[PDB]
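Risk mitigation, structural track. In case the binding assays with guanosine-5'-diphosphate fail to produce interpretable data, a predicted complex structure has been prepared as a fallback.
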Amino acid sequence: KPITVMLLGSGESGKSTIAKQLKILFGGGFPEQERATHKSSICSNVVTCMRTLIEQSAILNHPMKYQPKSKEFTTEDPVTLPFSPELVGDVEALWADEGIQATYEESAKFQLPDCAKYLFENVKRIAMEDYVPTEEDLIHNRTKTTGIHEYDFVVKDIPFHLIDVGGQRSERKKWVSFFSDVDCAIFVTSLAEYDMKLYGNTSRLTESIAVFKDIMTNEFLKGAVKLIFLNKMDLFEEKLTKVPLNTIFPEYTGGDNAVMGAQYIQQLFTGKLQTEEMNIEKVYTNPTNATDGSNIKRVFMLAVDVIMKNMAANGKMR
Ligand SMILES: Nc1nc2c(ncn2[C@@H]2O[C@H](COP(=O)(O)OP(=O)(O)O)[C@@H](O)[C@H]2O)c(=O)[nH]1
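Fallback model:
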């Protein structure tokens, strides 16, 4: 029987990106027909993300040199099926325009999907008539996984079964207790959300923390190893330079140091629990960059050993 792993997290923690990444690395990836289903949302995101920046450049007074010609940037209507011929061209001009670039740097804050820059840098290839999304596009594109995804992979000749629990907090609860005999629960959280508000909970950070505190006391998850992926370490490093951590936690003295800062956030989730960073009741932690296949491969590897060691010591095996 396969080793079972359950992914939990808040929204926009990147847990769905982790799951696609493991299917690519250890599953069979995604076949052309599965990939082609993502064409419309990717094509749509190209336009909507850029409308966002144009609108924000007005709200934030960064005048534009360039002026869009295409049908697509004269309307708020949903995005049609084949792009107008001029769409490609003015996406490239727009992204190179001084005012748009200035607006992009003030990304904190309005709400710009993480995939924006990737979409723009890839527009020549996305706007082609015969374009079929690649696995890398699927990694970077934003999708809403209304939540219950299963699959199997193998790692170093050992069967794994992955349960990806999505949905509202209210249905997430339903599924956690449905699955029996889970060997490992992986909690994913976005480091870059430390400054984002909400309104029960006030901020994204406190909402994630309370989710995690659930996992730690959930009686159906006793027996399961608890791992935390502090995700979006890349985004967090950079974000720290525009929104310093002590503007959110004035009781913090570590400054620009993304390592010390990630630890500070990590310690807010784990309190008095014993913890262990896999990079050299007990909670294992590791920062991650889910859009980096190489990073997720190296990191899940450490994880397999932690899961195996633990199971051996708990009288479970294979
Ligand atoms: N830059 C960066 N983006 C990420 C990372 N992890 C996830 N994302 C992005 O976050 C967006 C949505 O995250 P998603 O996997 O759908 O979250 P979930 O479904 O709520 O668990 C996608 O556009 C991803 O490309 C990361 O480590 N780095």
